[PDB]
Amino acid sequence: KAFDLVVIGAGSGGLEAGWNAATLYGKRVAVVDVQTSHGPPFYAALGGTCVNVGCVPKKLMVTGAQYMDHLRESAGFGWEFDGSSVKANWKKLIAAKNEAVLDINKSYEGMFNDTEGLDFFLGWGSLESKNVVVVRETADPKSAVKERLQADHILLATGSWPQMPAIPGIEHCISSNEAFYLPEPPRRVLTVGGGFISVEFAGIFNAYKPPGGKVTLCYRNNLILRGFDETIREEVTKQLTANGIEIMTNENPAKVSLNTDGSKHVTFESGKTLDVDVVMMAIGRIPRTNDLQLGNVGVKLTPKGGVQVDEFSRTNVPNIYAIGDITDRLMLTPVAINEGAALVDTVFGNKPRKTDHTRVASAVFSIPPIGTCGLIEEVAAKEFEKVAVYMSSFTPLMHNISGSKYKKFVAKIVTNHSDGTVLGVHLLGDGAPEIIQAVGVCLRLNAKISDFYNTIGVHPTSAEELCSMRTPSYYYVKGEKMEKLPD
Amino acid sequence: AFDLVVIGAGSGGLEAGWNAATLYGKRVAVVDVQTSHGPPFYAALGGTCVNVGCVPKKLMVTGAQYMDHLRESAGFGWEFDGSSVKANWKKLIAAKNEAVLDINKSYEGMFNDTEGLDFFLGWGSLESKNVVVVRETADPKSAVKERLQADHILLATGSWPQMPAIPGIEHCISSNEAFYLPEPPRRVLTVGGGFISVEFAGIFNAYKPPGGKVTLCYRNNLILRGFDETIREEVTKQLTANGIEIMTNENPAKVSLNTDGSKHVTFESGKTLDVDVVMMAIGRIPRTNDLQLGNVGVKLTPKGGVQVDEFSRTNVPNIYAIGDITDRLMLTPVAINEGAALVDTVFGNKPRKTDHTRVASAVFSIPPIGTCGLIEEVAAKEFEKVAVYMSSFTPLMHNISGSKYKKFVAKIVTNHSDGTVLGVHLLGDGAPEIIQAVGVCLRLNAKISDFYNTIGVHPTSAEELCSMRTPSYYYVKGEKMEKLP
Numbered sequence: 001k002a003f004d005l006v007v008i009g010a011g012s013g014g015l016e017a018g019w020n021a022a023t024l025y026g027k028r029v030a031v032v033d034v035q036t037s038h039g040p041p042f043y044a045a046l047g048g049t050c051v052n053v054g055c056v057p058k059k060l061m062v063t064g065a066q067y068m069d070h071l072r073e074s075a076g077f078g079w080e081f082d083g084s085s086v087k088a089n090w091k092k093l094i095a096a097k098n099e100a101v102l103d104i105n106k107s108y109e110g111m112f113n114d115t116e117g118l119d120f121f122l123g124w125g126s127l128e129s130k131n132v133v134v135v136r137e138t139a140d141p142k143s144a145v146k147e148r149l150q151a152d153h154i155l156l157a158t159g160s161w162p163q164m165p166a167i168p169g170i171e172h173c174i175s176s177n178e179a180f181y182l183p184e185p186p187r188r189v190l191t192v193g194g195g196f197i198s199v200e201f202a203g204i205f206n207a208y209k210p211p212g213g214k215v216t217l218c219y220r221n222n223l224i225l226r227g228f229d230e231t232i233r234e235e236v237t238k239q240l241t242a243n244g245i246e247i248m249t250n251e252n253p254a255k256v257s258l259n260t261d262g263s264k265h266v267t268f269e270s271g272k273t274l275d276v277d278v279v280m281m282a283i284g285r286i287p288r289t290n291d292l293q294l295g296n297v298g299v300k301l302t303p304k305g306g307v308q309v310d311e312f313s314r315t316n317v318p319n320i321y322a323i324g325d326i327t328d329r330l331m332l333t334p335v336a337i338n339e340g341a342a343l344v345d346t347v348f349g350n351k352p353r354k355t356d357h358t359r360v361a362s363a364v365f366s367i368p369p370i371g372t373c374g375l376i377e378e379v380a381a382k383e384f385e386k387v388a389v390y391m392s393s394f395t396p397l398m399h400n401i402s403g404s405k406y407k408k409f410v411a412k413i414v415t416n417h418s419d420g421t422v423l424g425v426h427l428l429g430d431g432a433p434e435i436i437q438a439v440g441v442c443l444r445l446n447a448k449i450s451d452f453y454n455t456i457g458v459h460p461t462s463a464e465e466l467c468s469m470r471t472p473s474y475y476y477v478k479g480e481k482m483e484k485l486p487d
Numbered sequence: 488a489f490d491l492v493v494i495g496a497g498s499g500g501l502e503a504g505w506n507a508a509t510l511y512g513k514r515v516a517v518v519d520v521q522t523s524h525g526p527p528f529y530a531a532l533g534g535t536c537v538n539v540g541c542v543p544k545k546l547m548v549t550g551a552q553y554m555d556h557l558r559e560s561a562g563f564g565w566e567f568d569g570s571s572v573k574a575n576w577k578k579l580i581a582a583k584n585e586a587v588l589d590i591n592k593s594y595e596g597m598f599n600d601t602e603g604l605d606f607f608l609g610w611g612s613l614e615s616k617n618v619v620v621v622r623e624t625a626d627p628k629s630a631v632k633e634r635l636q637a638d639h640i641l642l643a644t645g646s647w648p649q650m651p652a653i654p655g656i657e658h659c660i661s662s663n664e665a666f667y668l669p670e671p672p673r674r675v676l677t678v679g680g681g682f683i684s685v686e687f688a689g690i691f692n693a694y695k696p697p698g699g700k701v702t703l704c705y706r707n708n709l710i711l712r713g714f715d716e717t718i719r720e721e722v723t724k725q726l727t728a729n730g731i732e733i734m735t736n737e738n739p740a741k742v743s744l745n746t747d748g749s750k751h752v753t754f755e756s757g758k759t760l761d762v763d764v765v766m767m768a769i770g771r772i773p774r775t776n777d778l779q780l781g782n783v784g785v786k787l788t789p790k791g792g793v794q795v796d797e798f799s800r801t802n803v804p805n806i807y808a809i810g811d812i813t814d815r816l817m818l819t820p821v822a823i824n825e826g827a828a829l830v831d832t833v834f835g836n837k838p839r840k841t842d843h844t845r846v847a848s849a850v851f852s853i854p855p856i857g858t859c860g861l862i863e864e865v866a867a868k869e870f871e872k873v874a875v876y877m878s879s880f881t882p883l884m885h886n887i888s889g890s891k892y893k894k895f896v897a898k899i900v901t902n903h904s905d906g907t908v909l910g911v912h913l914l915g916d917g918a919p920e921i922i923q924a925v926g927v928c929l930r931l932n933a934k935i936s937d938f939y940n941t942i943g944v945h946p947t948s949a950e951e952l953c954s955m956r957t958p959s960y961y962y963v964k965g966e967k968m969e970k971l972p
């Protein structure tokens with residue numbers, strides 16, 4: 001079996017590369033993955049982490065969680081019903097999520113069956129030589145060989161995996177993988193970590209918890225969501241707290257033990273203790289390099305765990321490439337897709353293309369959600385002499401009527417004040433993920449603040465706030481925050 | 488005397504008045520017929536948008552969307568006593584009224600606390616080229632309250648619902664009265680295919696009592712003329728899917744009262760229909776009749792609008808007109824923009840004119856619409872080679888929500904000679920929020936490549952705009968075809 005391209009990992013980046021190479025350039029492509037559908041024992045499968053245990057199921061479950069707010073908020077608009085009859089059925093949510101993910105799994109299987117020159121191989125891929133991918137029954141190099149795929153080009157696209165801390169009792173904890181299949185919703189749950197996964201699941205568990213429940217989120221440092229706009233970091237903290245979620249900053253689990261009833265007794269480094277039914281570790285994700293036998297061929301890793309690549313996704317070994325989370329840069333599905341498409345254009349279409357990793361728009365599906373693109377102000381302050389910050393914060397009108405007055409919308413714009421170029425936009429509130437997409441197009445066009453405030457607004461929307469800010473709220477000159485420019 | 492007298496304390500009038508008083512310290516007078524919302528005049532301090540337009544409409548559509556939320560929650564495991572569910576229209580209106588009144592009071596405070604900015608209650612009209620007379624009523628013979636001497640006069644009285652001349656028209660309401668119905672109508676007929684008719688059809692559909700039915704009729708074949716045709720057809724389907732009856736090629740010919748107070752509607756086709764409310768939403772016309780424009784010779788357009796040049800100047804020197812009274816784009820942000828540009832031009836020697844192209848707008852139907860720029864059939868007449876990029880899909884949540892019919896539609900129209908985006912048209916939840924930043928993109932003359940080379944935000948409906956790289960069909964010399972010749 002001799003192929004133009006062998007892809008290890010049928011995920012976001014791998015599938016884009018395979019589909020493009022086969023359909024746009026008529027190449028013979030083989031793609032390897034460990035399962036054809038979502039779930040245990042391997043969780044990720046055909047379609048990748050995003051489809052199976054990532055963006056897709058997460059979005060469906062956050063959507064379900066939002067109905068706790070919708071039901072309560074409907075009363076302010078005249079909707080009446082027996083509030084004591086409201087119950088949330090977790091099994092129905094999981095079952096419905098499983099059907100939707102499975103429909104995607106089945107669709108991708110049909111893609112392979114019907115696309116000439118695009119073949120799927122079930123098993124574990126690893127590097128035997130520079131031009132041979134071996135597929136084995138299990139991740140263990142001692143397992144039986146299923147196929148040896150001769151490859152002119154090899155693409156490593158195995159994604160990432162939850163990082164689990166080595167504390168006593170870690171075996172009593174779960175990761176996001178298992179959270180997607182919990183048989184019942186935890187009455188008490190501890191989500192460990194300050195990143196988007198911990199925050200998003202905290203909102204899910206908070207909505208579906210049985211009566212007398214409580215969600216606690218802990219984070220080793222002082223403020224959650226490191227890397228996001230600081231104003232938004234503080235606001236989501238308040239709006240999470242306002243919805244019943246306890247946030248434990250400057251705390252970190254030291255050990256976990258079992259109570260007689262099966263619940264978990266958590267002890268933190270500070271000495272505090274907490275009894276919960278589930279402990280979900282979401283402290284990070286690390287590149288999935290352990291099963292590929294990279295040493296057989298000499299593929300180098302970076303000082304971090306990621307496969308080292310240049311801007312064209314080339315490793316140090318000729319004709320072996322790597323994209324997506326395994327490179328440990330921006331762990332986002334659309335980035336992996338773009339890298340895979342650019343790689344195929346470069347290798348097979350003599351159209352050199354490289355992914356732009358700046359000005360990438362992204363979102364956090366907390367409740368309310370975050371939408372962001374570009375630099376935060378403290379980063380821009382170290383790269384530009386004069387930086388201006390335009391800021392607007394307000395409780396939308398519907399939320400004064402709804403009774404959720406804590407739901408303040410935040411809109412921030414960071415600019416290079418020398419010429420007004422927009423460096424970053426940061427949004428908190430309903431619709432922020434949908435708003436920020438086209439803002440990404442604006443930033444690619446090097447839009448200036450005047451391009452925004454001279455655009456006529458759409459009324460009434462939250463987005464029009466971005467076109468209503470023409471005077472900076474404060475500045476950073478040579479890195480120093482100040483309300484007004486010197487002179 | 489006054490540097491500026493503004494007739495109409497609405498979107499454009501208040502922007503013009505506020506800017507002139509605070510940015511240039513000019514002495515400004517503003518006239519309006521009411522200080523707070525509601526009958527008999529409905530519009531008041533704050534304009535149509537605040538009192539009987541964008542703001543209350545948005546609140547009431549938000550309330551209407553909960554009918555879908557309550558139903559769709561079941562697909563995600565939520566249950567509750569469905570038989571205990573009631574949509575309390577009176578609570579909605581009461582909540583809406585207090586929100587609008589709070590805005591009325593806010594503008595009331597603005598006038599009291601801003602020097603050089605004064606408000607006069609009454610009906611304004613043109614006595615001469617430098618005199619605005621304020622009377623007690625719209626009747627030109629009613630008692631005079633004030634005579635405002637003005638170096639500059641701004642006409643900003645907005646528009647008014649159009650009503651057809653059919654027997655029994657008096658028994659029909661407009662959008663004005665719809666905001667104050669004491670009870671939600673069990674059976675309602677909304678007349679017209681425009682955005683007001685569609686938006687209120689969804690409001691009435693959500694709050695109607697048991698056994699209710701919303702019917703929308705339009706005199707031609709397809710509602711929402713002027714919007715993208717793919718969206719026009721898909722909106723029709725999704726309105727039908729939610730229980731709204733859409734009567735195309737039908738037009739009321741007469742209305743009479745039944746013995747129970749309901750209305751008996753006879754159509755031109757001979758069909759009949761009994762409803763509790765008939766809402767006329769066939770158009771909006773410039774509100775010029777009460778101004779006595781003949782006293783000074785302000786010329787009107789053949790369609791009834793106050794004729795203005797690019798800087799909002801009438802044919803009479805030092806008399807200007809902005810907003811819906813000009814019969815251009817009847818949008819609040821446009822009126823605001825025209826008002827600010829006028830003041831900058833007149834009182835700041837910084838000539839500014841409003842750009843009326845590539846303006847983003849929205850329809851808060853269920854599902855909503857977001858649009859900016861040209862539709863393809865207009866572009867086809869204006870450009871030799873036009874490409875249309877089209878994508879339809881079911882958002883993830885609607886695979887399990889129980890509303891499979893809620894397709895999201897994304898359309899991009901470009902000048903295929905250079906790929907310049909000429910229009911973007913969206914249908915589905917989030918479209919109003921998505922299209923705002925698209926307006927910034929069109930200002931920057933974004934090309935289709937600028938969209939599909941931008942990395943998407945996943946999972947969102949908006950990322951579909953960055954996923955269309957190949958045209959679905961073209962227009963060449965106005966001729967539709969799948970492939971180029």
Ligand SMILES: Cc1cc2nc3c(=O)[nH]c(=O)nc-3n(C[C@H](O)[C@H](O)[C@H](O)COP(=O)(O)OP(=O)(O)OC[C@H]3O[C@@H](n4cnc5c(N)ncnc54)[C@H](O)[C@@H]3O)c2cc1C
Pocket residue numbers: 008009010011012013014032033034035042044045046047048049050051053054055056058123124125126157158159160176197288291292323324325326330331332333334336945946
């Ligand atoms: C809970 C969660 C939520 C997320 N939400 C979002 C979001 O909202 N937006 C967003 O942009 N990103 C999100 N991400 C990130 C996104 O899922 C990843 O960045 C993206 O899936 C990376 O794709 P990839 O091609 O690098 O690898 P993946 O998509 O992870 O695909 C890797 C595939 O390789 C397979 N594989 C692994 N080892 C082998 C082997 N030896 N042989 C054969 N196959 C193998 C796996 O089964 C897997 O299917 C989320 C991630 C998580 C965990």
Ligand SMILES: Cc1cc2nc3c(=O)[nH]c(=O)nc-3n(C[C@H](O)[C@H](O)[C@H](O)COP(=O)(O)OP(=O)(O)OC[C@H]3O[C@@H](n4cnc5c(N)ncnc54)[C@H](O)[C@@H]3O)c2cc1C
Pocket residue numbers: 459460494495496497498499500518519520521528530531532533534535536537539540541544609610611612643644645646662683774777778809810811812816817818819820822849
């Ligand atoms: C139901 C509905 C929904 C709408 N929704 C939207 C939307 O979502 N988005 C959007 O952009 N636009 C919307 N519009 C349009 C928007 O309301 C108008 O385009 C905007 O208000 C125009 O403002 P203006 O300054 O032209 O006049 P207006 O804001 O209408 O103000 C005119 C004012 O002048 C006063 N007046 C009139 N005659 C006299 C007189 N003789 N003397 C003194 N005062 C007088 C009136 O009382 C009124 O307050 C909607 C309109 C309606 C009817």
Ligand SMILES: FC(F)(F)CNCC#Cc1nc(-c2ccc3c(ccn3CCC3CCNCC3)c2)sc1C1(N2CCCC2)CCCCC1
Pocket residue numbers: 015016019051056104107108110111112114115883
């Ligand atoms: F939520 C998700 F967004 F994740 C859902 N998945 C998105 C997708 C997809 C997709 N499905 C394809 C698909 C799916 C099924 C298919 C075929 C070809 C044949 N079949 C099955 C046959 C049936 C019946 C005949 N009509 C076509 C479908 C293609 S190709 C494809 C694209 N991607 C490439 C790889 C990643 C996704 C192709 C390029 C444009 C964007 C989407």
Ligand SMILES: FC(F)(F)CNCC#Cc1nc(-c2ccc3c(ccn3CCC3CCNCC3)c2)sc1C1(N2CCCC2)CCCCC1
Pocket residue numbers: 501502505537542590593594596597598600601
């Ligand atoms: F539809 C909306 F809901 F959006 C309407 N509200 C929008 C607004 C406003 C606004 N309010 C003002 C306002 C409102 C109240 C004010 C003052 C100055 C003094 N006051 C009184 C404040 C007192 C304080 C005590 N409590 C009573 C009110 C100013 S000035 C003003 C702005 N425009 C002015 C005219 C049109 C809008 C100013 C320029 C930026 C846009 C908004």
